[PDB]
Every structure is written in structure tokens, then in C-alpha cells.
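pls design
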């Protein structure tokens, strides 16, 4: 079967050395398995794969410093018409498919480093901000490796 298969590698941390929370060491460098998806499921612009979850955990939060956190992601957009779809790493790579990062509301986030996820209202101590990643077809996907990379920054308000 013709499939696209790959992983989403994400690294990141706080914008500022002096932040309301610490980013958990398990969250600052993660690799998310996107799975193997048949190109017949990605044969048309706007087709998407089943999303895979990944979390960003924040520790030791002090809500006297900030009551909310949000995350912005940076990565190469697959093309000017899909600024919320990551380009793939070129390594036998798939084409006409990229990777989207969704926040807890299901919105695919723009990948320009300035577009923040929906805000998470913090409790003191540990808080998790959930995300999902998935494949997004920009056309008739072709089989091959489909890895993507992005970086994130946590901002507080």
C-alpha cells in the first residue's frame, strides 16, 4: 500500500528566562509518531489524517506571576497558501502533504512564531497544554517519508 509515514519533532521552551512556570524537561524535546497513512486517504487538498496528541507540560507555576500560558510554534510553511501546514523534511520523501499542529480547540496554528495557541488558565504547580499533530494534504499525496520539525515558545500573561 502507498503510505506516508513519519514523525513530528518539536523542541522549545519559555520565551523568557524569568517565566511563571518551568517547562518540563520531557516537553522541551519530543518526537510524535504521526503513523502510517495511506495516500488514498490523502489524495485531495484538505484531506487530513487522524490527529496524534502531544502535550507541553509546565511545572512549578506561580499564578501570582501569570495566570495564563499559550504557545507559539515556528516552522517552515509548506507554501504561501498554507501557512498553518509544515513543510516536510526532505530526506524518498512524500509530496503534497504537510503537518499541522492543532491546539485544544482543534484550530491549526499559524507557524510564524507569533501566533499563539488558545490561552490555558493556570493553576499553581503543574499544568499541561495539549496539542495534536496530523497530516494535511495540499494535493494528491505521494507515498514516502513525511517528517516535520517545529520549535515552540511559551508566553505568559
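designed seq:
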Amino acid at each position: 500500500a502507498n503510505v506516508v509515514e513519519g514523525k513530528f519533532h518539536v523542541t522549545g521552551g519559555n520565551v523568557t528566562t524569568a517565566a511563571a512556570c518551568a517547562v518540563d524537561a520531557g516537553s522541551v524535546d519530543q518526537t510524535v509518531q504521526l503513523g502510517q497513512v495511506r495516500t488514498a486517504s490523502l489524495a485531495q487538498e484538505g484531506a487530513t489524517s487522524s490527529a496524534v496528541g502531544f502535550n507541553i507540560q509546565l511545572n512549578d507555576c506561580d499564578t501570582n506571576v501569570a495566570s495564563k500560558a499559550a504557545v507559539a510554534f515556528l516552522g517552515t510553511a509548506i507554501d504561501a497558501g498554507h501557512t498553518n501546514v509544515l513543510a516536510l523534511q526532505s530526506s524518498g520523501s512524500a509530496t503534497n502533504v504537510g503537518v499541522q499542529i492543532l491546539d485544544r480547540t482543534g484550530a491549526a496554528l499559524t507557524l510564524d512564531g507569533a501566533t499563539f495557541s488558545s490561552e490555558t488558565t493556570l493553576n499553581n504547580g503543574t499544568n499541561t497544554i495539549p496539542f495534536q499533530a496530523r497530516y494535511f494534504a495540499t494535493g494528491a499525496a505521494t507515498p514516502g517519508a513525511a517528517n516535520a520539525d517545529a520549535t515552540f515558545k511559551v508566553q505568559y500573561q
